Design a protein around this motif. Structure first.
Motif, PDB file in Angstrom:
ATOM      1  N   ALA A   1       0.923  -1.035   0.077  1.00  0.00           N
ATOM      2  CA  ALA A   1       0.049   0.007  -0.131  1.00  0.00           C
ATOM      3  C   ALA A   1       0.824   1.200  -0.142  1.00  0.00           C
ATOM      4  O   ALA A   1       0.755   2.068  -0.745  1.00  0.00           O
ATOM      5  N   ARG A   2       1.967   1.325   0.568  1.00  0.00           N
ATOM      6  CA  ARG A   2       2.913   2.424   0.587  1.00  0.00           C
ATOM      7  C   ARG A   2       3.356   2.848  -0.543  1.00  0.00           C
ATOM      8  O   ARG A   2       3.742   3.774  -1.104  1.00  0.00           O
ATOM      9  N   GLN A   3       3.868   1.458  -1.372  1.00  0.00           N
ATOM     10  CA  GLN A   3       4.288   1.619  -2.642  1.00  0.00           C
ATOM     11  C   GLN A   3       3.129   2.293  -3.748  1.00  0.00           C
ATOM     12  O   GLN A   3       3.346   2.945  -4.582  1.00  0.00           O
TER      13      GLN A   3
ATOM     14  N   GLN B   1      -3.039   9.995   9.652  1.00  0.00           N
ATOM     15  CA  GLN B   1      -2.202  10.529   8.669  1.00  0.00           C
ATOM     16  C   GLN B   1      -2.504   9.960   7.497  1.00  0.00           C
ATOM     17  O   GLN B   1      -2.653  10.818   6.218  1.00  0.00           O
ATOM     18  N   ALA B   2      -2.780   8.752   7.390  1.00  0.00           N
ATOM     19  CA  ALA B   2      -3.256   8.165   5.856  1.00  0.00           C
ATOM     20  C   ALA B   2      -4.374   8.795   5.334  1.00  0.00           C
ATOM     21  O   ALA B   2      -4.631   8.878   4.212  1.00  0.00           O
TER      22      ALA B   2
ATOM     23  N   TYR C   1       4.515  15.832   1.083  1.00  0.00           N
ATOM     24  CA  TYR C   1       4.749  15.931   2.525  1.00  0.00           C
ATOM     25  C   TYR C   1       4.090  14.971   3.399  1.00  0.00           C
ATOM     26  O   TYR C   1       4.764  14.318   3.857  1.00  0.00           O
ATOM     27  N   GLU C   2       2.930  14.765   3.073  1.00  0.00           N
ATOM     28  CA  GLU C   2       2.082  13.840   4.002  1.00  0.00           C
ATOM     29  C   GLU C   2       2.450  12.433   3.682  1.00  0.00           C
ATOM     30  O   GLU C   2       2.359  11.578   4.580  1.00  0.00           O
ATOM     31  N   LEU C   3       2.720  12.243   2.334  1.00  0.00           N
ATOM     32  CA  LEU C   3       3.215  10.891   2.067  1.00  0.00           C
ATOM     33  C   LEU C   3       4.796  10.541   2.758  1.00  0.00           C
ATOM     34  O   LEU C   3       4.951   9.546   3.344  1.00  0.00           O
ATOM     35  N   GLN C   4       5.555  11.430   2.644  1.00  0.00           N
ATOM     36  CA  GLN C   4       6.887  11.452   3.410  1.00  0.00           C
ATOM     37  C   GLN C   4       6.578  11.030   5.002  1.00  0.00           C
ATOM     38  O   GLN C   4       7.428  10.310   5.433  1.00  0.00           O
ATOM     39  N   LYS C   5       5.705  11.763   5.644  1.00  0.00           N
ATOM     40  CA  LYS C   5       5.477  11.530   6.972  1.00  0.00           C
ATOM     41  C   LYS C   5       5.014  10.190   7.364  1.00  0.00           C
ATOM     42  O   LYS C   5       5.377   9.527   8.356  1.00  0.00           O
ATOM     43  N   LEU C   6       4.382   9.412   6.442  1.00  0.00           N
ATOM     44  CA  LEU C   6       3.663   8.249   6.738  1.00  0.00           C
ATOM     45  C   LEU C   6       4.939   7.109   6.917  1.00  0.00           C
ATOM     46  O   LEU C   6       5.746   7.232   5.979  1.00  0.00           O
TER      47      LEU C   6
END
Lengths: 29, 42, 44, 43, 29, 31
Positions: C4-6, D3-4, E24-29
């Motif tokens: 999911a992260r990718q 966050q997600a 930005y929010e992606l990097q924080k994840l």
């Protein structure tokens, strides 16, 4: 020429429908 | 994990919808460029 | 989770590709805009 | 995943941004088609 | 013409702001 | 101008590759 204008119309309607669905799914989540 | 899955699928689908719309617009845009250069000669 | 992260990273990337494609198309559209106005002056 | 869920909301919102931009691009593009259509009918 | 270009640009401005946010929010994840 | 044609075709091709990537990764997360 007429081909692409009509294709764009169908493509925009499908994107508007999907946008509505995603925004509904976003709020339910 | 059904909730997040169908939302991610919808987002991926919407990215394909927007890409296809932009590709169809590019075809029309190029056709207008063609009509321009033909008129510029006549 | 790792999948999911990718995917999320590819989604944000896709958003950037589409944005840049629309921006470039807008510059092309503006060129055709002036090409028309000049043609409109030359023949109308 | 607060966050997600915020990231997903920003993605969906941005897709509405992009859809509205290409809708606006289409209306301007339609004008240029007609403008050219007008000129070529003249020549 | 010019104000449909004004409408379009404005929509791309906000898409650019949202892109920087989402990255930005992606990097924080 | 040509360059704008050049830039757009490159961006659309890259969007096309990334779209396939994302759908493939989505299928992977599903299955």
């Amino acid at each position: 020429w007429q081909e692409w204008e009509q294709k764009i119309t169908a493509l925009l309607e499908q994107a508007q429908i999907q946008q509505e669905k995603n925004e509904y799914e976003l709020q339910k989540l | 994990t059904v909730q997040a899955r169908q939302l991610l699928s919808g987002i991926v689908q919407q990215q394909n919808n927007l890409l296809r719309a932009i590709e169809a617009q590019q075809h029309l845009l190029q056709l207008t460029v063609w009509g321009i250069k033909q008129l510029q000669a006549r």
